[PDB]
Amino acid sequence: ISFSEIIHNALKEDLGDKGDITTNSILINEKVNFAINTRENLVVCGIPILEEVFNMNKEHVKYEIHKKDGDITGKNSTLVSGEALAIYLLPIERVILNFIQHASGIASITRQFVDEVSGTKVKIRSTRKTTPGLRMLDKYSVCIGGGESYRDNLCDGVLIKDNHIASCGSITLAIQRLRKNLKNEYIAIECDNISQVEESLSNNVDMILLDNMSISEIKKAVDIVNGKSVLEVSGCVNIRNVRNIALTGVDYISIGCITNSFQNKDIGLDIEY
Amino acid sequence: KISFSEIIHNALKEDLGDKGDITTNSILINEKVNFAINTRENLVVCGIPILEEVFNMNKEHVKYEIHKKDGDITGKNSTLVSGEALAIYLLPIERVILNFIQHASGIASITRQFVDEVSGTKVKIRSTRKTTPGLRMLDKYSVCIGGGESYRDNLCDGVLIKDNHIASCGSITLAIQRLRKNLKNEYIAIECDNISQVEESLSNNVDMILLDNMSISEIKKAVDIVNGKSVLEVSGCVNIRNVRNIALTGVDYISIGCITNSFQNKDIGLDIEY
Amino acid sequence: MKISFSEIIHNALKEDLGDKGDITTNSILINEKVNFAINTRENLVVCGIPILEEVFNMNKEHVKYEIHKKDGDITGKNSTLVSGEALAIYLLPIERVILNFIQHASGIASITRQFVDEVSGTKVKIRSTRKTTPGLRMLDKYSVCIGGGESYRDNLCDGVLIKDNHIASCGSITLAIQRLRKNLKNEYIAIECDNISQVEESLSNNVDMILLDNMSISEIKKAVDIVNGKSVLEVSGCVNIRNVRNIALTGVDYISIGCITNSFQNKDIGLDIE
């Protein structure tokens, strides 16, 4: 997965054409030892972004990676250390930290959900309710946290949604039109009641997504589906009920709030003398 | 003025790539639908210009009316925008439009929460640069829609001497003397994390002093020591349950990282009739 | 997705308006309203109108306009492309940006149209190259299409074109094609040749498309004969307008011309104010 464009855009928004007027008006040739240090427990994510950014400035930053993406670490853990020309380091500090705090926030909440469905068959998935401009970083971070993804975007998978059904008039017609136009594509469909589950099953779809159903309804869907289709539960599922959802027998749980509405992790850049 | 045209293009490109929306394009032909963008909870509306801009790309196939504008405070089940569209042009932009307005309103709404809680004091709530990568300006705009303010947009448009400047050059006094030699007549703000640093900043006649992660006790002391000679700002992720006690101290600004990261997106949906 | 000019628009605005904006306009004008027209000063193929639309649309409260010609329209001297009413303070700072775009885009569309007309009644299509203006690859290729031309590929990612320098780097045409085929199964393969021997060897390897780079009319005629319609044939180079028809009648499929996206004349178009 390439991060080069998002890195550029993050640098550009913070550094513009004039650059860092504070740093540049104070520092010349000072060299500093630094450390990227966690201020809380987290699943590490975003180190490749930090590497790509430091690697643009290879003559001016020397560094050592102590933790790789996916490592679980405690408070006060040094993720990366090294030495730099301060005039090259301080202007990129906030861009690097904002990336790894965001990415580690996603990896960490995801891992909390994955740990809580441990010993069931279920995999946690991301959705498309991701931060604008960071679709791929967000889905990558969910994967580093132990989750999966059905598709990256609207181009690489079929998912017939509530609003497709309301627009064409029926699940049956929607699947009919799609089968004609697409070459034996894997079909996923969103259902918000049991009658839609039954209709989706009549049409031999590959995957059924249960949207905002009660646990009793989810169990009924599991029963009627009877292993003839993949089943996924969607919504913002909180940490206190994801296990009960998992134990129904569904295959996947997709969660919106692991990629929006989550806590960034507190990570800082500490500089010596 | 602020433009969103690039962040919109990048959001569209990441979701629609080169193949377009394969699901919608393989199912819909000429169906027309009535739609409403409806809130599912109380919120401060923000991001409407983004919706307008995306909708304006398909003027022939999307007809709409705005019912609420940015900054409007609205309730649950409120229609922000309604209209009529060729479904084949609307469904592929639904998630992009909603991700934007959910994010923007989340920020504007948390900001307004903090703004209301320091009501009856002089305090203004400010954004920081701990914004979502690629959305610096949307995020700061959204804080402003919510009743907040901003010291600077980025590293180019204002001076702010940090812990790491002080650490790299060795002293507050050297940093300021060098900055003044290079930027005459420039407004100077500096981050302090103890009283000694507040005292040294004052000797140097700075315009603005940020108190970074100081205790309520230290802040009250800083206010007494500063004696109105400089602007005073408190900076950190402050609980909503503690923000007012900080505002009662006498400081001028409170900047809060967590109104632009670590906030709840607002719940807003696209309902199709039907 | 439809082509987006939002990024190149922002960079053109930023380079001309910077952080201080238009100091001349902002220091003279207040609330003055003006009728305006964007008028051609000669014959041209209209190109770049969507850019003009996007810029005007950033200032919708302060600029009211009507489009009278669309991209691809062929129009005469003293033709009004767009007219309207604007607060002067908002129109004058974007004048030069908008004019530079449409004058550039229309210059490309117009020179292309010239080459297209001159090969009329042959099977030949005029193609763009990658010898475009830096930062305007997509605008330049778009403007060639507006002018009746076509494009093999947008850039180095979306088609194979084995070049003189590939052949020189690996040692042979046969080894280059073999390696590519090993790595990209069923990729359409184009290769540039600068003599008949290289055409013969490319044909032996069953390539889909052969480019003739700076060959004489005599060699081009020999190539057409040897190829015998078994590969697509394209002539590439800065053909003169007075010699492109001759090339077209040899029976090649395409002519690629570098000098329709560089070294062309901008069209003269102005902003007239009452």
Added chain:
Amino acid sequence: ISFSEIIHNALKEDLGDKGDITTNSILINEKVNFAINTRENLVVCGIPILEEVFNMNKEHVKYEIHKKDGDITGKNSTLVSGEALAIYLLPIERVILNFIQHASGIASITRQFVDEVSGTKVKIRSTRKTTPGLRMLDKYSVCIGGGESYRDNLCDGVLIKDNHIASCGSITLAIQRLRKNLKNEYIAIECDNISQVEESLSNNVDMILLDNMSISEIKKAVDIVNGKSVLEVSGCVNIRNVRNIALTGVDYISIGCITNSFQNKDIGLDIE
């Protein structure tokens, strides 16, 4: 002058996310000797862009600079040579070549006009009719060709135009407003007739630009101005009349056509 952003945007439009699929599918560790060679006479310009691009890939490209910006050179002249890993060189060939061909184009035509006004006091200037996104490269290239620039953009100098006058109603009013609002700015005004020249003089402007006047009107303006303001000519300036214009006694001639509607120079990358 920074070229970093323009480099980035040129690389981005040509290499995107997938990179160079032809090069990456044919080559691996092949190393090549290369030369960036002129196919015609020119004023060299854009070498610092080539240097900044190559310096991104320092491990993969070694190079020698034979000609610097402003050097006048002949057909078949090697500007830069060296050795590179082919897989790193070929993907940036077109970006590097388009920059130096554009920049050399501007510097070369600028120099032609400069040579033609030689022995007069006149300086050739650039305008703002530059290629979109290349304002600074275009103005730099004009300077390398022996020209000058009044301002980089609308922020760093004042120029009262025809449309400011049409919008506010008079030269006198426009200048009066500007002097209140701006702190002692150098004032330049565009005039398309002698009445406007006269009015600008009574307002003690610093510079007057004569927009598309006849040689006889320009001479009249030189006479009336009498050294009390800088005089610049803009308009239908071609190589065959620029000296006549220069001999009138004006100070500057600004030329739109040296930054748009000019010939790129033919330069190529030759490999062994």
